[PDB]
């Protein structure tokens, strides 16, 4: 109660909406129970999953009697959004996809016989997942592969989103020597998902933990890469928690820090303090007769966890996006010149 941060209402832990007011798609109930119960995702996996379940929910139209397709679908899809809003708070890859999707719903005209609706929403959202995600990531690979010399190391963090393919490309498709160090954190052990895939493909993975973060950097080490959840308007990064400690340790021990991001993921909002806009994530996960049971019913005890916190832009040497490399203080120029306009 001294800082009162545990009563931050940016997430609501209410569950079990039983209301049959709308036709909630059973696939989207599978998607929400797949997100919120056992988190299998990053950010662009959530974006591709949300996008290819909205694919199915527009393919299964079921239009009402007197309402045109241009006058129902945004409210229907917003009530589809509300279940994910209950499940897990949204990324910017959530938001900059759904507002684009609503803008593309808006420019349809009341003459579609609900047969070309597929041909201008399914194909167009496939062009979205092609353009603003996948070939953009292909440009990320082809832009960041020239900035890695042979026989070096890489320190990623958590589950990567795009640069798993970068490490696989520079490991196998370009055959230059590389020694990836993957480090992750309690409780979402999502660096192991990178470690299984990278070592299954046959690259020198050396897993670690973030508590032992000192002895990684005392080896021969350079080129810390970082997956991003969003990049703010100032230059502050925003990603899975525990990123910023190895960011400040990496800048402290004068070895460079990079962020592989794409122009879909830049955000309009602004913050500079870490615990301001943030997600509380289910404090029963930090236990696994257990070690302790019942932080409740014991007065004066609490268990907190944080998913998201900010590296200051002094630490990131280079944000790379599909247009090119850039200093992190110069992200509003791609907020204004390229995001949305491309």
């Amino acid at each position: 109660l001294e800082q009162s941060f545990d009563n931050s209402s940016l997430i609501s832990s209410v569950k079990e909406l039983l209301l049959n007011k709308d036709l909630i798609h059973p696939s989207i109930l599978l998607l929400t129970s797949h997100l919120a119960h056992y988190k299998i995702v990053g950010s662009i996996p959530r974006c591709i999953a949300m996008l290819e379940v909205f694919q199915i929910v527009i393919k299964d139209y079921q239009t009402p009697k007197g309402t045109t397709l241009s006058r129902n679908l945004t409210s229907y899809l917003s009530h589809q959004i509300d279940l994910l809003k209950k499940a897990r708070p949204l990324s910017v890859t959530m938001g900059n996809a759904i507002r684009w999707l609503k803008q593309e719903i808006s420019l349809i005209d009341p003459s579609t016989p609900d047969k070309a609706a597929k041909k201008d929403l399914c194909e167009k959202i496939g062009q979205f997942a092609k353009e603003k995600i996948e070939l953009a990531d292909q440009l990320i690979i082809d832009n960041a592969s020239t900035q890695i010399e042979e026989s070096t190391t890489i320190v990623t963090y958590g589950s990567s989103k795009v640069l798993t393919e970068l490490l696989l490309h520079n490991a196998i498709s370009l055959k230059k020597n590389i020694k990836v160090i993957v480090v992750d954190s309690r409780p979402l052990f999502e660096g192991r998902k990178m470690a299984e895939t990278l070592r299954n493909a046959g690259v020198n993975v050396m897993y670690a933990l973030i508590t032992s973060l000192d002895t990684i950097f005392n080896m021969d080490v350079d080129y810390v890469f970082l997956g991003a959840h969003s990049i703010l308007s100032n230059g502050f990064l925003y990603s899975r928690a525990g990123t910023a400690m190895l960011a400040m340790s990496a800048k402290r021990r004068n070895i460079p820090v990079l962020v592989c991001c794409e122009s879909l993921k830049f955000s309009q909002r602004v913050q500079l303090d870490s615990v301001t806009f943030n997600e509380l994530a289910d404090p029963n996960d930090l236990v696994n007769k257990n070690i302790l049971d019942g932080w409740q019913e014991l007065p004066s005890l609490n268990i907190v966890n944080i998913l998201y916190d900010l590296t200051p832009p002094e630490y990131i040497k280079k944000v790379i996006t599909e247009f090119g490399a850039l200093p992190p203080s110069s992200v509003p120029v791609i907020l204004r010149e390229y995001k949305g306009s491309a």
């Binding site: 092609k130 353009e131 603003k132 070939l135 953009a136 292909q138 440009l139 599909e322 247009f323 491309a342």
Partner: protein, 249 residues
Amino acid sequence: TSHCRFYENKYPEIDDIVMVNVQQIAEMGAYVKLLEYDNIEGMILLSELSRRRIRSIQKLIRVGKNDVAVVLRVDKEKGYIDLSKRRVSSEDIIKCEEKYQKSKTVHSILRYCAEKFQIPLEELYKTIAWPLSRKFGHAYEAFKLSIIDETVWEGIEPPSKDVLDELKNYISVKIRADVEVSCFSYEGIDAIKDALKSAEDVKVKLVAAPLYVLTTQALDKQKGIEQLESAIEKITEVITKYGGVCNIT
């Protein structure tokens, strides 16, 4: 050997309409190779591709894919030649696309002939290409009329007659039915004969006394929908007037 000219001029002479694909775009525009003279290549300017400035994220989706392009200028002794597709009308797209589909379906019928009879590809190609593409339009509707009017083959000679036979060999569907004649009669044979005498005149085969395998030929695959059904109807008609029982799968 592999592929060669259209019409015995080294380059696409000024202001004709050809087809290309874009290879890569860095700062000059694309290094478009000409799809009609395949091994050759030209280029094209950035401001010439549309009017819009091409995004890199837009630049990546277009490479490799092919399109139509008019030719502005040509060096007669250098292969360093320009293309253009801002000044291409909408009708010319479909016209040159039809001409190039025509071109590919008259190239594919000679590629394997030259590379499996093992002769120089260009010589017999040009001895076809002088009279048939100079007299009128080239080899597609020339060869669709050549198999019915054989004066094309004797108008000019090929160096061998095996490629002649293979070109005659190149350019020149069953719906299965297991109808079960489960009859218990005395005038059934006659009925069966009658059925045969209308459903076969498509491919009808006896298996035993009850089972018959008939594979009805379809032209649009959907034109045998009106055939099989008709046959079934005939069968139904047939057995009520004789005494037996026919059942259809």
